Design a protein around this nucleic acid. Structure first.
Ligand SMILES: [Zn+2]
Lengths: 21, 208, 216, 86, 128, 104, 47, 129
RNA sequence: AGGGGAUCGAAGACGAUCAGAUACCGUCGUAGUCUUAACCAUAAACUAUGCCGAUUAGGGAUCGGACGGCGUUUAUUUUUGACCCGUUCGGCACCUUACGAUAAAUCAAAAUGUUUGGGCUCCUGGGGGAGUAUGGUCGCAAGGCUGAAACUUAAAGAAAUUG
């Protein structure tokens, strides 16, 4: 459930970068 | 003799001390890898080590030590009481650190312990009782030199000197001869013929 | 942040610029214990986190949750490595994982398929490795085809510099941690295979540690 | 070593074990080098001249390094009548 | 009534730094500690003084492991140069005759090496 | 899983062995599986020896011994505390326990 | 392990595969034609 | 019982090499074994070998020098055309540049590369690289 | 089907316990337990590990045969027998180790397998229905061997870790 800090992480690159509406 | 002259013969004086200290007496148990360093087995008794072959390995071990750039990179280990004093005296005459008694495992692997060392060579009195020292040497690429009896593990032991390894006098005498050879290859003794002024009994053990 | 203080003898020599390149360390097989050594010789090393998965543990009051992270790095020119570390905090684990990855960087050997015309593109031979019920096999391929593999192992081969290859998998490959560790072991063994072109005798030279004198 | 137009393309050329000939891989901890000094006519140790050997971790674990060194040292004329084949 | 590590650890360093300055008397040892140490409690000072005066009572009869002070070391390395006048290995002075005793098959080894002139006595060995 | 390498039986090299009767519940178990204890004791307990000694008519006398061999099934062995459960690593140790020879 | 491996043992290998092929469930329902017999649809798509 | 002396010789060599020895002994000796060793010897994979002659079958003592990875035998000696010879080198050879597949033909036993030059085919018996 | 029938004891009859006790506990007790002449052919019939052949590591015990040796013991005594030391062939097993193998427990084989081929026979393909229905065959009977389908389901199961 580690999805809290992905909004303003900028310290790693995820696979499927979640596009925002 | 492509790389050694004839002046390295044992001579009558050096041999005379060896068999007077019972350095030619082994244990009943015989390892398969120690078969070459066996002259004959006594009828109804123990094996007998070949003292003639002992000198060549002793000289070879000394020649490896001299190759080290600074003497502080050589480390000498002992745990049993019979070898505590001889190790410390060996460290004082030449240049070397000495570790006597408990080894404090993690010395060669952990970099935050107080007794952290980075040696280039290790000399061990007894492979069986100093297994922890040998085990950590296999992690960081250091060759091992050890004194061995008729029965002894030889894992990670590149150079083996056949000796009693358990006598009171035998352990001290071998460490004394090794120190003398190291100084001989350097300019300290200045000559093979001249005698050394330190007495063999200094490298012994005292009860109190 | 500020300048680092070397702790090992090797670290001091690196700081003084007494060794040429990282392959000098590789030739003599010396252990590395300081991550400031790797990034001094190999800049522009890319990092990319694979996934994070929780792990539980039962206690009297309840269940204790920790987070495990898997990170692999590489330069796309013959160097690659990965590290795994778990901790009580998600952010803390990622930072520690990157450090472990840097310590394990290894070189790869790249060969030709058929005739050689410069810039080797594929594996020299076929190699395989096993890590706990997962086996991965790699086969050299002709120039022109891309990498044929699952998305998990395609990323690792991309960062190792290998361009063309064939892949085969066996066992329970759904265990992602086991799959990556098996691929990493197969590539590491490329230099362990004795091809006939390596039969030529080499000259032994003294290690840098022995012939240099360190500072106080 | 590999070539394309006569120039080396290998990243580096690894070394070989002296006892068995296997390639000593990187990260193979437990592999050591043995350097033996060279003596002059009067017994002093010559500086800068030495003989180098390399042993892989595999032979050390088996416990055969002692016999391997004896055979190699005797071959290079360093020892007398200490190693032989039965 | 068991003393914790803080009292015991502090007592060890005091003894080795200032060995002669304090004696077997508990009353005098109480006044030495507070002068050469920073203690914020009288009760803590009393306990420190109680342990250190107990330690020197057992020091008076034989040394104890874990304690080292300057007077003790210097005496130790004075004793370590002890050396006899006649060597134990040397046997010419020892024994009723200079020549020593060996067994039969050792002499055969000596013959192989060429040192026949060594004066030895050979005795057969067998039990069966 | 095998809990013991020898199956807790000590029977290899043969097919059958005749059973015996338990000394407590009269159960049938193979002879090699039972726990056997050999005991040597006196006819009378040590406090009573003096009363017998001075009441004899043969000057000095030596009371005879009695020899018994009790043997139990495993169910009756660990309920009477003849033997007890050991740890996983301590199971593979068949040396007899060192009897106290000083008794404080 | 345990298969016949000789150069003239093509009869045993062919016979063995035919017999053990019935242990499969997908193939067994195809060979017996249960759909043509038991299914409410006569092996068709709609009805 | 002994049904393939060639497999016994090749298996015994492989075990000794993997454990690091330098010499091997082979108890039964035959013409096919000797002709197989000669092909390996001419490529430098082994050194001299000598066949002591007892009156039953003789023995062989081979000298190893490393350089050898594996040597195996195919037990059913299939029949291979000249056109399908490229299928086998893809199967049981680590790479295209090196490695040899041993065949038996009416012109003696030979490796897979000279047979292409002479345009001959036959039966497959083993491999080594 | 005959002979035999001491002891134990399926079935059965009583005494206690218990809310109940057609059981566990106690006193009796038939078939059986033994043997001769014929049937039956199943067991956790287990090392849950098929048979022949090759190679791979150290050790000390033990049973049978042969060979070598210093002594002790002993006899109408020597040679033989008993004890001691060493080598070797064939067995029931064990300890340490891992270069190796496995998911692991663990293994001198369960190793020489993604770098896959020494020879041969039998058996298994998610869990239930089911070793059931039916046909055939053997048996005095009890039963043995061979052996389905309709229908139903997203999990059963193995080794280890923390509570
Ligand atoms: Zn019982």
């Amino acid at each position: 459930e580690g999805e809290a800090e992905l909004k303003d992480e900028q310290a790693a690159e995820e696979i499927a970068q979640t596009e925002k509406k | 003799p492509a790389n050694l002259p004839s002046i390295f013969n044992p001579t009558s004086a050096d041999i005379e001390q060896l068999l007077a200290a019972q350095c030619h007496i082994g244990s009943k148990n015989l390892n398969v890898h120690m078969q070459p360093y066996v002259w004959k087995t006594r009828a109804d008794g123990v094996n007998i080590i070949n003292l003639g072959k002992t000198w060549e390995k002793l000289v070879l071990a000394a020649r490896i030590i001299v190759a080290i750039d600074n003497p502080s990179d050589v480390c000498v280990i002992s745990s049993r009481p019979f070898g505590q004093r001889a190790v410390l005296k060996f460290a004082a005459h030449t240049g070397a650190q000495a570790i006597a008694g408990r080894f404090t495992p993690g010395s060669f692997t952990n970099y935050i312990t107080r007794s952290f060392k980075e040696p280039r060579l290790i000399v061990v009195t007894d492979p069986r009782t100093d297994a922890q020292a040998i085990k950590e040497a296999s992690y960081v690429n250091i060759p091992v030199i050890a004194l061995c009896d008729t029965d002894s593990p030889l894992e990670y032991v590149d150079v083996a000197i056949p000796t009693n390894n358990k006598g009171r006098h035998s352990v001290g005498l071998i460490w004394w001869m090794l120190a003398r050879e190291v100084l001989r290859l350097r300019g300290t003794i200045y000559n093979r013929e001249t005698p050394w002024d330190v007495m063999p009994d200094l490298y012994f053990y005292r009860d109190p | 942040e500020k300048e680092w203080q070397p702790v090992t003898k090797l670290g001091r020599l690196v700081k003084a610029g007494k060794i040429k390149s990282m392959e000098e360390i590789y030739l003599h097989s010396l252990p590395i214990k300081e991550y400031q050594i790797v990034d001094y010789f190999l800049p522009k090393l890319k990092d990319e986190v694979m996934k994070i998965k929780p792990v539980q543990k039962q206690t009297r009051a309840g269940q204790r949750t920790r987070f495990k992270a898997i990170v692999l790095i590489g330069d796309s020119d013959g160097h690659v490595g990965l590290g795994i570390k778990t901790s009580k905090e998600v952010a803390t684990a990622i930072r520690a994982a990157i450090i472990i990855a840097k310590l394990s960087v290894i070189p790869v050997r790249r060969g030709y398929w058929g005739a050689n015309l410069g810039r080797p593109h594929s594996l020299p031979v076929k190699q395989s490795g096993k890590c706990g019920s997962v086996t991965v096999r790699l086969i050299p391929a002709p120039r022109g085809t891309s990498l044929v593999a699952s998305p998990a192992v395609k990323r690792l081969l991309q960062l190792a510099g290998i361009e063309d290859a064939y892949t085969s998998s066996s066992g329970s490959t759904k265990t992602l941690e086991n799959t990556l560790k098996a691929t990493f072991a197969a590539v590491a063994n490329t230099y362990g295979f004795l091809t006939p072109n390596l039969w030529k005798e080499t000259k032994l030279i003294r290690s840098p540690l022995e012939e240099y004198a360190d500072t106080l | 070593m590999e070539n394309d137009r006569g120039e080396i393309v290998d990243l580096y050329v690894p070394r070989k074990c002296s006892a068995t000939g296997r390639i000593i891989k990187a990260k193979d901890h437990g592999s050591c080098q043995i350097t033996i000094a060279k003596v002059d006519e009067n017994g002093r140790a010559i500086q800068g001249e030495n003989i180098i050997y390399a042993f892989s971790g595999f032979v050390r674990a088996m416990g055969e390094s002692d016999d391997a060194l004896n055979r190699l040292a005797q071959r290079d004329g360093l020892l007398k009548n200490v190693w032989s084949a039965q | 009534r068991v003393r914790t590590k803080t009292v015991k650890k502090s007592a060890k360093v005091i003894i080795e730094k200032y060995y002669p300055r304090l004696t077997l008397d508990f009353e005098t040892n109480k006044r030495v500690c507070d002068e050469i140490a920073v203690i914020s409690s009288k009760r803590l000072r009393n306990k420190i003084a109680g342990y250190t005066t107990h330690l020197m009572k057992r020091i008076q009869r034989g040394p104890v492991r874990g304690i080292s002070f300057k007077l003790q070391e210097e005496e130790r390395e004075r004793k370590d140069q002890y050396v006899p006048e006649v060597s134990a290995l040397d046997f010419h002075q020892n024994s009723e005759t200079g020549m020593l005793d060996i067994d039969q098959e050792t002499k055969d080894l000596l013959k192989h090496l060429g040192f026949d002139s060594i004066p030895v006595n050979v005795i057969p060995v067998t039990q069966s | 899983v095998k809990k013991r390498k020898n199956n807790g039986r000590n029977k290899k090299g043969r097919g059958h062995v005749k059973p015996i009767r338990c000394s407590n519940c009269a159960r049938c178990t193979p002879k090699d599986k039972a726990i056997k204890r050999f005991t040597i004791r006196n006819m009378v307990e040590s406090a009573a020896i003096r009363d017998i000694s001075d009441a004899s008519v043969f000057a000095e006398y030596t009371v005879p011994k009695m020899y018994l061999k009790l043997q139990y099934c495993v169910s009756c062995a660990i309920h009477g505390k003849i033997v007890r459960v050991r740890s996983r690593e301590g199971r593979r140790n068949r040396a007899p326990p060192p009897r106290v020879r000083y008794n404080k | 392990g345990g298969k016949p491996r000789g150069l003239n043992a093509a009869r045993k290998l062919r016979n063995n595969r035919r017999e053990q092929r019935w242990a499969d469930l997908q193939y067994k329902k195809r060979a017996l034609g249960t759909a043509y017999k038991s299914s409410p649809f006569g092996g068709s798509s709609h009805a | 019982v002994r049904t393939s002396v060639l497999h016994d010789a090749l298996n015994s060599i492989n075990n000794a090499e993997k454990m690091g020895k330098r010499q091997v002994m082979i108890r039964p000796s035959s013409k096919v074994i000797v002709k197989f060793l000669q092909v390996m010897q001419r490529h430098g994979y082994i050194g001299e070998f000598e066949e002591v002659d007892n009156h039953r079958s003789g023995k062989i003592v081979v000298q190893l020098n490393g350089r050898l990875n594996k040597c195996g035998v195919i037990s059913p000696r299939y029949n291979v055309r000249l056109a399908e010879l490229e299928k086998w080198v893809t199967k049981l050879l680590p790479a295209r540049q090196f490695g040899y597949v041993i065949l038996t033909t009416s012109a003696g036993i030979m490796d897979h590369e000279e047979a292409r030059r002479k345009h001959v085919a036959g039966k497959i018996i083993g491999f080594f690289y």
